[PDB]
Each structure stands twice: as C-alpha cells, then as structure tokens.
C-alpha cells in the first residue's frame, strides 16, 4: 500500500511542476493585456456605425465620406428588412 501511493504522488508532482513553469509568465502579463485589448476593441467598434500612396490617401478621403453617409442613411433594422424579401415572395405564390 505505501509503495503504491508513493508512486502515484510522484507522478502527480512531476505533472504539476511542468505546468507551473509555463503558466507563471502568462498570469503575470494578463491584466495589462486585457485592459489594452478592451480599450482597443471599443475604439475600433465606434468607427463601424501620381504616386500610388498618394492615390490611396486621396481615395481614403472620399471613402471616409462614404462611410459617414452610409452610417447616417442606414436604419437600425436595415438588416432585418433585407431578410424579409424571400418570405414576401412565398406568400404571393401560395395565394
């Protein structure tokens, strides 16, 4: 009984030691990451609702207007309305 229990405890210790070595660095850097990532994601979410470089810069200026106009024109249920089209057509055929 004593030999059998000792063999099992040794195996458990080996396994815990291998895990501690790799988990310790990740837990220490967690809080700064979570906070930086959340602030980043919230900032990104607020934006959704000649020389070739020079060209892409001019294009960006106009696409920015486009993005602003689309955010203004689009109703809150626009996506739901867009899904109703097939259902409307089915009703007509049944009648």
């Amino acid at each position: 009984r004593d030999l059998t229990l000792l063999q099992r405890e040794e195996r458990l210790r080996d396994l815990i030691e291998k895990q501690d070595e790799v988990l310790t660095p990740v837990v220490t850097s967690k809080d700064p990451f979570k906070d930086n990532y959340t602030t980043f994601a919230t900032a990104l979410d607020s934006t959704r609702h000649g020389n070739r470089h020079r060209y892409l810069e001019e294009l960006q200026k106009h696409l920015a207007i486009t993005k602003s106009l689309l955010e203004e024109i689009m109703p809150s249920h626009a996506s739901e309305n867009a899904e109703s089209f097939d259902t409307i057509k089915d009703l007509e055929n049944i009648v």
């Binding site: 396994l15 850097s29 689309l70 899904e83 009703l91």
Partner: protein, 140 residues
C-alpha cells in the same frame, strides 16, 4: 467473523459508488505527455503574442492603413441594396393579392345549368337548395 464480513460489504459498496462518479476519468490513456507538450507551446505563443500586442498598442494604437475602409463600405452598401429591394417587393405583393381576390369575387361563369353566375352566388343558391331540402325532411 461476523465483523469482518460486515466490513467487506461496506468497503465494496463505497468503491462501487466512487467508480460511478469517475466514469469520465476512466477513458483512453492518450499519452498525457503529448498533451502537456502541446499546451506548453500554446501558452508560450500566447504569452509572446500578448506581449507583441501590448507593444503595438502602446506604440501605434493608444502596408497602407486602407483595408478596413474598403470592408466597411462594401458590407454597408450591400445591406442597403437588399433592404430597399425588400420594401419594394412588399408593396408589389400586397397589391397583387388584392387584385386576385377581387377578380375571383366579381368573375361570372357558367358553373351548372343554363344560368351565368359568380362563384358566391352559385354557392349561395346551392346552400339554399339544401337548406330547403333539410327543412322539408324535419317537418316529416
């Protein structure tokens, strides 16, 4: 003797109860050593990526930057298209249905015999006839 036998029955019952609780633990000996190695790699990567992100977040967030503008405009414009088409279809369908039903109520056809009538009139006539037949049978 009587005490030993009672001790066996108690321990046997305790073992049976614990084996049932540990059903998920009893499956296939996959090489525990392999899973740990894999976990080690994933954690190590995760740690490296978190650091890399924090570094970029502090320096740049806190290749042309044009990719996200294209995606947004594309998806928003597409949704706008589909929405307007749906509104138009609803109006058309509603009007078509009103016409089909109106035509059915007003259309005159030779249904039975020599007389032309609407479907509603002929149906009423037929109903009256069987009401009359039933009344003549209850007075019997």
């Amino acid at each position: 003797m009587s005490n030993s036998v009672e001790a066996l029955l108690e321990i046997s019952s305790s073992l049976k109860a614990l084996k049932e609780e540990c059903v998920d633990l009893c499956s296939s000996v996959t090489d525990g050593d392999k899973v740990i190695q894999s976990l080690r790699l994933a954690l190590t990567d995760f740690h490296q990526l978190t650091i890399a992100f924090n570094q970029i977040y502090a320096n740049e967030f806190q290749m042309s930057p044009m990719g996200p503008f294209f995606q947004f405009v594309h998806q928003s414009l597409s949704t706008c298209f589909k929405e307007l088409e749906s509104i138009a279809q609803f109006t058309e369908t509603s009007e078509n249905i009103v016409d089909v039903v109106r035509e059915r109520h007003q259309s005159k056809e030779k249904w039975a015999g020599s007389t032309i009538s609407t479907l509603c009139e002929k149906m009423k006539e037929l109903r009256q006839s069987y009401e009359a037949f039933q009344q003549s049978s209850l007075q019997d």
